[PDB]
């Protein structure tokens, strides 16, 4: 089988991939943005989800992976800090994704709607989950619900090949 990326404009929390990842906060509370959507799905999944910035933890609702992603507050984090915490939380993204054993993911963009600090982030945080992405098998979903930033995550992807 030939991993994909392929991008969706709907609601995250409406995917039909075999796990999620939230765009959390450190805390695992719930927030505006993907949050709502997750934990008004599965709330349950906020049990011990608290876990750093630049950290993911997984936790199961039954046989259903959430991955909480911690991607950095650009408001908080310097531009040179919060490149790093981003890099980092896509890459512990790859890592539950691969120890999960799950043959699709549904993932947003870290850092670029609450924690973008009011800055364009897109092809920022898709370098990145590219960058972490790359190595894995899994099928991978990008859920958006800007129209302009469908067509641009679309090119980004179809450009690499
Ligand atoms: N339901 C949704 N489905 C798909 N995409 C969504 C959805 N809600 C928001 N988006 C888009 O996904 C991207 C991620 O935005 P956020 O969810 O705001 O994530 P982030 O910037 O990482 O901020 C994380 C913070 O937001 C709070 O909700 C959460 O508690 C955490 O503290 C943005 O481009 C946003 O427009």
Request: with cysteine; glycine share 6%; proline share 5%.
């Amino acid at each position: 089988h030939a991993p994909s990326y392929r991008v969706k404009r709907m609601d995250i929390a409406k995917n039909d991939e075999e796990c999620v990842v939230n765009a959390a906060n450190p805390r695992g509370l719930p927030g505006d943005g993907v949050c709502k959507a997750v934990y008004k799905k599965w709330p349950e999944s906020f049990k011990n989800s608290a876990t750093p910035v630049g950290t993911a933890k997984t936790v199961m609702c039954g046989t259903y992976p959430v991955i909480h992603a911690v991607g950095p507050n650009f408001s908080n984090y310097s531009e040179s800090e919060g490149d790093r915490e981003l890099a980092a939380a896509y890459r512990e993204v790859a890592k539950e994704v691969t120890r999960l054993g799950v043959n699709s993911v549904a993932i947003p963009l870290l850092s670029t709607g609450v924690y973008s600090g009011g800055k364009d982030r897109l092809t920022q945080s898709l370098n990145h989950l590219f960058t972490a992405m790359d190595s894995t098998d899994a099928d991978v979903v990008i859920y958006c619900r800007d129209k302009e930033w469908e067509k641009k995550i679309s090119e980004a992807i179809q450009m690499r090949t």
